[PDB]
Design a protein around this ligand. Structure first.
Ligand SMILES: [Zn+2]
Length: 146
């Protein structure tokens, strides 16, 4: 209830230095120099540890007489933003046995086969075709085959 600042200056400065894009409700940084207040999150190098103000909500700092600074995720913007989290979702989504369309997976991610194939290779390391063949090869080799 009521998105307020942290319990101390050090505790709040943490979220600021952390640059957590999911700080929707953290605290807006008021700049006395430029006279602007950044959304709860934000990570733009502005105002040192003395020339910066702390506001619970953008409405609070704005009323005081400051200009709002966007581009720091104010509310509703990034759906996920993550290469590892994306491929992880694909790996689970592609838990079928029948050959699935490549571009189809590209449709959900809204990217080309170069990104998915590259990302999947950067994390997984092996293509989806290798996974299926891996099980078959393991079942055959497990019987002292080859
Ligand atoms: Zn900002």
């Amino acid at each position: 209830m009521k998105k307020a600042t942290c319990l101390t200056d050090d505790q709040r400065w943490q979220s600021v230095l952390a640059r957590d894009p999911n700080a929707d409700g953290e605290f807006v940084f008021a700049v006395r120099t430029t006279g602007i207040f950044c959304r709860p999150s934000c990570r733009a190098r502005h105002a040192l540890r003395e020339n910066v103000s702390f506001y619970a909500n953008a409405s609070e700092a704005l009323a005081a007489g400051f200009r709002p600074c966007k581009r720091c995720q104010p509310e509703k913007a990034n759906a996920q933003q993550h290469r590892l989290d994306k491929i992880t979702h694909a790996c689970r989504l592609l838990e079928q046995e029948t050959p699935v369309t490549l571009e189809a997976l590209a449709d959900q991610v809204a990217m080309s086969p170069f990104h998915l194939h590259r990302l999947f290779k950067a994390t997984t390391g092996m293509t989806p075709k290798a996974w299926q063949q891996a099980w078959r090869a393991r079942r055959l080799r497990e019987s002292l085959a080859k």
